């Protein structure tokens, strides 16, 4: 049947889950970084630890974001292609502070150039 | 906290959903897959005519799976090669696997991620 998901459904499915992965890529070598994230107005907000390779690999680079969930009947997944941008604006920073993330430190947003979703049938 | 190999391979057995990550010329793709662990290998089934087939099989792939509660979480990353199951012993082991069933296609295409490296981390959020 139909398994392609729409944008409004993709962004809300991402909010049902607290854990996703950043995927960075250089030439033919890629890295994956599990992150705790929240969705804010079609952006993927997460917080990054200083001096870690996630900061260097992602910030101001093209990245992949992925999150998924499943039950015994069906599963879904959402992929965001975009760019990781440091939260550096006053209004950007105030919005990031309203985020109910899991319990100095830098905020980062994945700004989407495309978002896609699939549902998988078991 | 860095995790040993024996913790990673067991932690992988605690969850049924992981992701294959394939890479070609500065552009990655990611494929969520239902999987089980069999003798330090990552077993999964592939749907025919799918892009996962062309992208992962016989190429170097990343495999990742994770989990978390309110306090802490973990993740495991496997670097290896995806190879199809082409052997009566391998085939017999793959058919005992506790994998989620899907659809009326009795078409089977067993693939294993043969690990070249496995690593794991524990994370706290503090
Ligand atoms: C459940 C969970 C949630 C996390 N949430 C966040 C978050 O919200 N924000 C954040 O900034 N970071 C988070 N992390 C950490 C992040 O995913 C990476 O572990 C980290 O960015 C790696 O930085 P590093 O400099 O220590 O890597 P390095 O030490 O330079 O990495 C060396 C090698 O270790 C391996 N490795 C590194 N990290 C992992 C990993 N997580 N799992 C498996 N192998 C790994 C890779 O093979 C890598 O090549 C989380 C990790 C986990 C497990
Ligand atoms: C929960 C879950 C479990 C799955 N388990 C398995 C499994 O065990 N075995 C298996 O063979 N397949 C599994 N799949 C499907 C697997 O991800 C497909 O191989 C993948 O969708 C690519 O198939 P395709 O050739 O039709 O994609 P294409 O048509 O080649 O993809 C075109 C574009 O669609 C987008 N896209 C593709 N797949 C996804 C996705 N999953 N989420 C978001 N965007 C996507 C990408 O942007 C991609 O560039 C699962 C999917 C989900 C959601
Ligand atoms: Cl400015």
- E strands, chain A, where? 19-26, 29-39, 44-48, 62-70, 74-86, 106-121
Atom of ligand 2 nearest to the CA of A69: 1
Phi-psi group of B125: left, alpha or beta (phi > 0 → left; psi -120 to 50 → alpha; rest → beta): left
The resolution of the experimental structure, rounded to one decimal in Å, is 2.7
Using a CB cutoff of 8 Å and minimum separation of 24, what contacts does A48-54 make?
Answer: A48/A105, A48/A106, A48/A107, A48/A108, A49/A105, A50/A105, A50/A106, A54/A22
Say yes or no for a CB contact (<8 Å) between B30 and A66.
Answer: yes
B66 touches chain A (CB under 8 A): yes
Angstrom distances, CA of residue B2 to CA of B8, B62, B91, B110? 10, 18, 34, 31
**Residues of chain A found within 8 Å of residue B27, distances taken between Cβ atoms:** 25
Residue-wise DSSP of B24-35: ETTEEEEEEEEE
Q: String of b and e for A9-41 (b: at least 16 CB within 10 Å)?
A: ebbebbeeebbbbbbbbeeeebbbbbbbbbbee
Structure-block tokens of residue B73: 């979480």
Structural domains in chain A?
A: 1-122 (2.30.110.10)
* CB within 8 Å of B51: residues ≥ 6 apart: B29
């Amino acid at each position: 049947a139909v398994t392609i998901l729409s944008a409004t459904e993709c962004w809300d499915l991402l909010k049902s889950v607290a854990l996703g992965r950043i995927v960075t890529t250089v030439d033919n070598t890629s890295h994956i970084f599990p992150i705790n994230f929240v969705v804010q107005n079609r952006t993927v907000l997460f917080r990054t630890a200083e001096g870690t390779k996630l900061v260097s690999a992602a910030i101001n680079n093209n990245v992949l974001f992925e999150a998924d969930d499943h039950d015994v009947e069906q599963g879904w997944s959402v992929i965001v292609r975009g760019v990781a941008r440091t939260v550096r604006d006053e209004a950007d920073l105030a919005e990031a502070q309203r985020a109910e993330l899991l319990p100095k430190t830098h905020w980062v947003r994945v700004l989407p150039t495309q978002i896609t979703g699939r549902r998988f049938r078991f």
